[PDB]
Design a protein around this ligand. Structure first.
Ligand code: MG
Ligand code: MG
Ligand code: MG
Ligand code: MG
Ligand code: MG
Ligand code: MG
Ligand code: MG
Ligand code: MG
Ligand code: MG
Ligand code: MG
Ligand code: ZN
Lengths: 176, 94, 38, 136, 134, 135
RNA sequence: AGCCAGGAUGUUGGCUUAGAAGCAGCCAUCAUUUAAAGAAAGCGUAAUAGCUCACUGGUCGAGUCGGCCUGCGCGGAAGAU
RNA sequence: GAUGUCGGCUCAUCACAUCCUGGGGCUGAAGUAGGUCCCAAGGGUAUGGCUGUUCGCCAUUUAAAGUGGUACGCGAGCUGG
């Protein structure tokens, strides 16, 4: 509602295509398409996008706020883009990129090979760092969660795959 | 100055009084002086909020019964056995 | 996870959330405060 | 644990527990714990609740118990058939009707009385409400 | 960077100052004699507070502060140790002339603007240790 | 929580000190510890300067009563006032050294003669000496 | 609500303890500079440090907070062909 | 004008309040090994010494030796302590 009422400014170079509930947002950093909930009425006009409830839909304003939020990060995606940074903590824990595949050494018998999806690219500045880049905020978040899942940070030494901005609280082992 | 709006009761008894309370209203009585006692009906929410102030039981209140103004004092109160509601009020003519 | 009929906030970092018709207590500070009504 | 010191008779008819309470106002203290429900309070329940409210106020202020368990309750033990006399008195109850002020308190702030009465209410078999003293 | 309270003409023993400041990287014989050379003017039997400022090259510089408020109220009332239960047990007495004596000494460290502002700050230290104003 | 009785009283106390003082200094003080502030409060009281942090809404109200009704456009961001009630100057010099030595903040604008002084031209009330200099 | 910034001085309050410096306990809980900052709500240290809150200035710009009387629902809810 | 009782043997069938194996949250979970709760009924789930015993105690196993319903399942199926 406060989110829905806030208009999304479409910058110069960003193309907006609306086919009813289907919205295509084209930019320099790629193209993203989303189908908005029927309760959402989207209006283009000027260099902005406005969102409102559709008459007869009980959750219109809650839906319009979600649609707003989504279209705002679609616009950011196809212009600036998104960046998720992960860091490996632990002895022998190393990472490398070979095209669209992240090779992860994480204390297992077999090294882990993670296949990246369309639109997501990775680069390892260090053997203990993964930098993901993409237009889709949801897909980059999913890939970062999938990579972290291979070895989630342990509470005794902070070992595992963590997000760069992650606070890993450690604890002492049971006494005696 | 507390101003209570009241209407004279068109009925009396158990049935009529329970019907008033089911309609968010409650019976009350005004007595004292040479005048005949006057059986009235009050809006529950209006009088409930008023009596929350300690001044309701000490000050001279004014009951407005069909245009006419009656100077009174709260005499007795019958409260609901366990709910924050009023069942009946006695007003004495001041 | 504590599963019980009476689920409450146990500290300021506790949050009551309804997920799929189940009342839960999710805490950002204490894992022992994580509850599910059941 | 409350109990009559002596009684005219040992045993009592079951009786019924119809009606609304007598003694519905806060008569001695500033706050009260009032019955919203109907039922029987045992001497053990009354003592458990008295203990809970007393610990809560750190034995500061003053507490009144407006209820008294004066009704004797008999019970027949296991492996005993019907009849052969009325059972033996095991415990004492107070009959409670909607509206009885069960306990009263003063000499403590409202927030502390509400908490002490919240703790005491959790020991009781009947629903209660927090009440305050009124002008008439 | 550490804060300590060492005696007027005494600085060297292991239990009070020894491995407390030595663990960081401070010279134990250099500070102990440079501190007593400057605090020689300060009267015998008065704990004087000193703040240490250490750098990356193990070097050090110190600024000497005026004796504590809970320290000066003991010698003014004639007591060695304060009350175990303050305001519940009285251990001594100090006049209005003695309150202004501690305040005029503490003026270099106090935040107060007037003499009455600094005197009330010593009045609070006296009440919280069991010493009554008489 | 500040009530309207409190708000009216703060406008009253700063409106009174506005009339009596000669040179007033408006500046920023965000990102400065209390140790350095209690040090500028000791350096202020000494130079006969009144130091305060007031809500910019409350200032626009205390300043409306003339002659600082030009300092309005400096009541955007954290605002700290330096009212010199004893001898014109003192603050405009005290703030310039405190700004340069601490690097934090920028010092918004100064006021004297019922005229606005920009952030660059604060060298006018910084070069002025004593009262007490004409002899 | 979020976000920026501060969260000081006497002082490491007194007693106790190898140490207790807001943060084992016990007692007191004022006063100063103040926009505001408890002689300290929790985590942390052998004790300090360090992190954050109560509180306050800025930003933002129109609503926001949780008690009362009530209707209908939700969890609590495991059994044998 | 009769519905045969305890225990065993044989043969089972269901529930789940789960003994093992499977998944998971918390742990006063370093690991190994545990504690507790949630999900889960697919399969699996000792032989002996004593006693009519069911049970129980004991010996030695096992991943484990589950808890209950079925006329305290089962004598026109057996036994008869
Ligand atoms: Mg009838
Ligand atoms: Mg789910
Ligand atoms: Mg705010
Ligand atoms: Mg027959
Ligand atoms: Mg189950
Ligand atoms: Mg349990
Ligand atoms: Mg099975
Ligand atoms: Mg075993
Ligand atoms: Mg059988
Ligand atoms: Mg046969
Ligand atoms: Zn919590």
């Amino acid at each position: 509602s406060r989110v829905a009422k806030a208009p999304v400014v479409v910058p110069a170079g960003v193309d907006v295509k609306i086919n009813g509930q289907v919205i295509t947002i084209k930019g320099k950093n790629g193209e993203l398409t989303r189908t908005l909930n029927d309760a959402v009425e989207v209006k283009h006009a000027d260099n902005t996008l406005t969102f409102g409830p559709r008459d007869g839909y009980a959750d219109g304003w809650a839906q319009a706020g979600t649609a707003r939020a989504l279209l705002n990060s679609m616009v950011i995606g196809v212009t600036e883009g998104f960046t998720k940074k992960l860091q490996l903590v632990g002895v022998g824990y190393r990472a490398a990129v070979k095209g669209n595949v992240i090779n992860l050494s994480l204390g297992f018998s077999h090294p882990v090979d993670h296949q990246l999806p369309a639109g997501i690219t990775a680069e390892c500045p260090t053997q203990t760092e993964i930098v993901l880049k993409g237009a889709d905020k949801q897909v980059i978040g999913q890939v970062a969660a999938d990579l972290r899942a291979y070895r989630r940070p342990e509470p005794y030494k902070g070992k595992g795959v963590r997000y760069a901005d992650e606070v890993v609280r450690t604890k002492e082992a049971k006494k005696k | 100055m507390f101003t209570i709006n009241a209407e004279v009761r068109k009925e009396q008894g158990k049935g009529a009084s329970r019907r008033l309370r089911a309609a968010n209203k409650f019976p009350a009585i005004i007595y004292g002086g040479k005048e005949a006692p006057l059986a009235i009906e009050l809006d529950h929410d209006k009088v409930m909020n008023m009596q929350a102030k300690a001044e309701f039981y000490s000050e001279v209140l004014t009951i407005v019964v069909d245009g006419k103004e009656i100077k009174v004092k709260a005499q007795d109160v019958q409260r609901h056995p366990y709910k924050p509601k009023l069942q009946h009020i006695d007003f004495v003519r001041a | 996870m504590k599963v019980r009929a009476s689920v409450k906030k146990l500290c300021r970092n506790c949050k009551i959330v309804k997920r799929d018709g189940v009342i839960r207590v999710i805490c950002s500070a204490e894992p022992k405060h994580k509850q599910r009504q059941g | 644990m409350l109990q009559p010191k002596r009684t005219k008779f040992r045993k009592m008819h079951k009786g019924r527990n119809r009606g609304l309470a007598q003694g519905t106002d806060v008569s001695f203290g500033s706050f009260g714990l009032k019955a919203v429900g109907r039922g029987r309070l045992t001497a053990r329940q009354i003592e458990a609740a008295r203990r809970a409210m007393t610990r809560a106020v750190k034995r500061q202020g003053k507490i009144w118990i407006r209820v008294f368990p004066d009704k004797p309750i008999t019970e027949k033990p296991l492996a005993v058939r019907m009849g052969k006399g009325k059972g033996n008195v095991e415990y004492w109850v107070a009959l409670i009707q909607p509206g009885k002020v069960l306990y009263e308190m003063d000499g403590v702030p409202e927030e502390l009385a509400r908490e002490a009465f919240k703790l005491a209410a959790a020991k009781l078999p009947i629903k209660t409400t927090f009440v305050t003293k009124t002008v008439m | 960077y550490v804060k300590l309270q060492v005696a007027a003409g005494m600085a060297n023993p292991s239990p009070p100052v020894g491995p407390a400041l030595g663990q960081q990287g401070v010279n134990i014989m250099e500070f102990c004699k440079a501190f007593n050379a400057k605090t020689d003017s300060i009267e015998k039997g008065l704990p004087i507070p000193v703040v240490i400022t250490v750098y990356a090259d193990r070097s050090f510089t110190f600024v000497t502060k005026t004796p504590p408020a809970a320290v000066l109220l003991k010698k003014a009332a004639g007591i060695k140790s304060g009350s175990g239960k303050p305001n519940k047990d009285k251990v001594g007495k100090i006049s209005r002339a003695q309150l202004q004596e501690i305040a005029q000494t503490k003026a270099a460290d106090m935040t107060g603007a007037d003499i009455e502002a600094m005197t009330r700050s010593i009045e609070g230290t006296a009440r919280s240790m069991g010493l009554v104003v008489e | 929580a500040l009530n309207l009785q409190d708000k009216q009283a703060i406008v009253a106390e700063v409106s009174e000190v506005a009339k009596g003082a000669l040179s007033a200094v408006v500046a920023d003080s965000r990102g400065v510890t209390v140790d350095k502030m209690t040090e500028l409060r000791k350096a202020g009281r000494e130079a006969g300067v009144y130091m305060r942090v007031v809500r910019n809404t409350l200032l626009r109200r205390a300043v409306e009563g003339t002659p600082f009704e030009c300092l309005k456009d400096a009541f955007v961001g954290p605002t700290l006032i330096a009212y010199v009630t004893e001898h014109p100057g003192a603050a405009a010099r005290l703030f310039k050294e405190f700004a340069k030595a601490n690097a934090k903040f920028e010092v918004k604008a100064a006021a004297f003669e019922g005229e606005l002084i920009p952030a660059s031209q604060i060298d006018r009330l910084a070069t002025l000496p004593t009262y007490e200099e004409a002899i």
